[PDB]
Design a protein around this ligand. Structure first.
Ligand SMILES: [Cu+2]
Ligand SMILES: [Cu+2]
Ligand SMILES: [Cu+2]
Ligand SMILES: [Cu+2]
Ligand SMILES: [Cu+2]
Ligand SMILES: [Cu+2]
Ligand SMILES: [O-]
Ligand SMILES: [O-]
Lengths: 439, 439
């Protein structure tokens, strides 16, 4: 196949993407080994769905797992009556998700399970895929002439030819695996044919962070989770927390081999030690560095100029309410809280008004990083840790290190009941989720 | 007695004002005629209660009326478990109100009935009195040396020696009477002994407005409903809507007689006409001018200098929510609404958080003036009709002319369920009231 493995793409046809996908245990070859994973569409990752604004999506999910499951259309500002976090598809049963892609939308999104208490094992086992919304902006020469690739960043651990089971420590920290893969491949080689690359990045890991850096090169950030920036932003590195997406341009500077790495990063994961009267928690410290892929530049690279502009960010109405959402931890219990409570699907935590804007202050009072996700209503990050964000773009996950406060501008869009939760999915399963009702 | 009639004063003693008051039909002489009014403490107005911050008030109300009644401590930022708008004292029964006067408080307040559906006839019949909170500011020479008087502005209409009954038109407009009285007296004479007067003003009328102007003189506004301004404000006239209070200094300029008048004012009251195929509503137009009292200045008046400052207004925290409350009318039905609903004591309309600040935008979409009152939580009027307020002070009633929006800064104080409503009390009785719960 092509030197660089990427998931199969399924494209809408005549404005309709109609597809039947089964969630199924699937024997496959993974990183040189045979394993049985849980997959959509018989592959890991699942197929990439590629659509345009105003397309109709009609996706019938058949559940061939021994437990119930469902789908979250992560990042899509659609109705929570479609992206329904409370729906359960029993084993053997099917459900059809039908929605129209919003007109003002572009970027890299994804789909994965969201059945409370079962997300972490299902996601860890291989149930996820990407969804790309193509934009008229993709036609500008500076993007059209770039070489485009999707990178799905997901790690895995195998035991007896199956995904390794969750330990108690896994429920506390979120599970990370030793196989650090890109598109399900182990350190693939990307042999660039053009001097400018456009890379869509997705962190579909349960808990692993990717502190991304390309040897000898900066990255040019052009989109965040849910849409384009207003103009490219040069960065030396880019941290992608679980659930986050980004799009970057890479401008290859000279011939040669360059490593794309996940640099050491300490997300506050914890171990246990006994030093002669202990039996107490101790920091794991930073992750060991990982090579994600080998990037070979072409002969005499002459990259395109950067686009001068991307998409102007909408001017939002003045906000009508300010919310405060405090995250805390009980590590030894592996319990996680928002404003002192664990999730209860029958309990509404916030009630807001559609078409108004809110300010959400989300404060991490724990010691671990927590990546905060809100369904249905993309937001603009104003600041985190008291530092103003250096760009305007739509996001739907924001990472908070210990002690940090994020201030978000949240326009409420579709009416209905939805959720917000930590996207270290173990923490969500263990209670770190709440309910927002929009009317 | 003294040329200028004022209600009897009852003062706290040793930090305690303990008093038994009966609500009772009372034969009395009023404006030269014998009438039976409903009174507190056998007088009209009721006795003036005079207290200081941190005093304890223990007021036992005995109901000797043929219908249930209760008290509203209008303007007092105390608990709605004490100032309870839902409490009913049956005929023949008694209830003791006990509270501590807040430490940061000063001004002219009042007490009257608030039993939904029965307020207008009870208030019109004579059930009201003043409460004054004395302040250490009263000791500054510029106030101490002034001649102080209370003016209770209340009109009345009599029929067969009793308060005139409410007509259907009265329920629509709010009832006004032909006897326009000050402290229950008809055009009394105030023979000033000092050149500077300090007048506490109370509009205790059901519906009548007082566009106050003293012949040949400005007024110096020094307090609004619920506290002092930051410094005196010179005005040529001063409109007092139902429920409002103000304190002014008058600086007598020369010897002579000066009329204090209620100048013509059109509050949008309506009549009916038939002009040959009509039978339709027509504006009553402005009120006829009234003389309230005759003010005789002393010989060679040399008024005191004005105080340079009064009380600094508190710096409020930034607000956490914005509310919108739209007033509308169905005149021919005599029904009045807030956000399209009439009052329901079982229904909570707004839920706010104690010790936060809110912005309330109150919009009058009717054609009549509506004076909007909020219990328990005094507010700062920021602007009305798009015009910024020319002073900072605590208010608890704000007048809105047809079409006007008032923007209020509302710190939420005591926890519990309370109400907000139009203080044309007929309109409150006919539905223009809502419920705020603070937790
Ligand atoms: Cu997700
Ligand atoms: Cu978390
Ligand atoms: Cu979710
Ligand atoms: Cu009142
Ligand atoms: Cu009214
Ligand atoms: Cu009231
Ligand atoms: O999610
Ligand atoms: O009231």
């Amino acid at each position: 196949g092509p030197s660089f493995p990427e998931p199969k793409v399924v494209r809408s046809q005549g404005g309709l993407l109609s597809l039947k996908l089964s969630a199924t245990p699937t024997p496959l070859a993974i990183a040189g080994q045979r394993a049985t994973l849980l997959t959509y569409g018989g592959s890991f990752p699942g197929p990439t769905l590629r659509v345009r604004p105003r397309d109709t999506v009609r996706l019938t999910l058949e559940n061939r797992l021994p437990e119930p499951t469902n789908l979250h259309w992560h990042g899509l500002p659609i109705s929570p009556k479609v992206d329904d976090p409370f729906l359960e598809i029993p084993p053997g049963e099917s459900w059809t998700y039908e929605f129209t892609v919003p007109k003002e939308l572009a970027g890299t999104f994804w789909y994965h399970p969201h059945l409370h208490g079962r997300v972490a094992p299902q996601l860890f086992a291989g149930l996820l895929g990407a969804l790309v919304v193509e934009s008229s902006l993709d036609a500008i020469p500076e993007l059209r002439e770039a070489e485009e690739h999707l990178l799905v960043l997901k790690d895995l651990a195998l035991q007896g030819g199956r995904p390794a089971p969750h330990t108690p420590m896994d429920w506390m920290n979120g599970k990370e695996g030793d196989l650090v893969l890109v598109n399900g491949a182990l350190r693939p080689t990307l042999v660039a044919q053009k001097a400018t690359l456009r890379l869509r990045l997705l962190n579909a890991s349960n808990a692993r962070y990717y502190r991304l850096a390309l040897q000898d090169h900066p990255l040019y950030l052009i989109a965040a989770d849910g849409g384009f920036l207003e103009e490219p932003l040069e960065v030396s590195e880019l941290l992608l927390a679980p659930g986050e997406r980004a799009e970057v341009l890479v401008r290859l500077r000279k011939e040669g081999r360059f490593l794309l790495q996940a640099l050491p990063y300490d997300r506050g994961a914890m171990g246990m030690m006994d030093m002669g009267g202990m039996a107490h928690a101790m920091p794991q410290g930073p992750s060991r560095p990982e090579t994600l892929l080998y990037l070979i530049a072409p002969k005499n690279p002459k990259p395109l100029p950067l686009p001068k502009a991307l998409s102007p960010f909408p001017t939002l109405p003045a906000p009508v309410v300010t919310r405060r959402l405090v995250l805390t931890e009980d590590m030894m219990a592996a319990r996680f809280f928002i404003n002192g409570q664990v999730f209860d699907h029958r309990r509404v935590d916030l009630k807001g008004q559609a078409q108004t804007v809110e300010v959400w202050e989300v404060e991490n009072q724990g010691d671990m990083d927590h990546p905060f996700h809100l369904h249905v209503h993309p937001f603009q990050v104003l600041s985190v840790g008291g530092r103003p964000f250096p760009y305007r773009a739509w996001k739907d996950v924001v990472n908070l290190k210990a002690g940090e406060v994020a201030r978000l501008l949240v326009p409420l869009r579709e009416k209905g009941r939805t959720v917000f939760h930590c996207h270290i999915v173990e923490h969500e399963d263990r209670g770190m989720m709440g309910v927002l009702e929009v009317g």
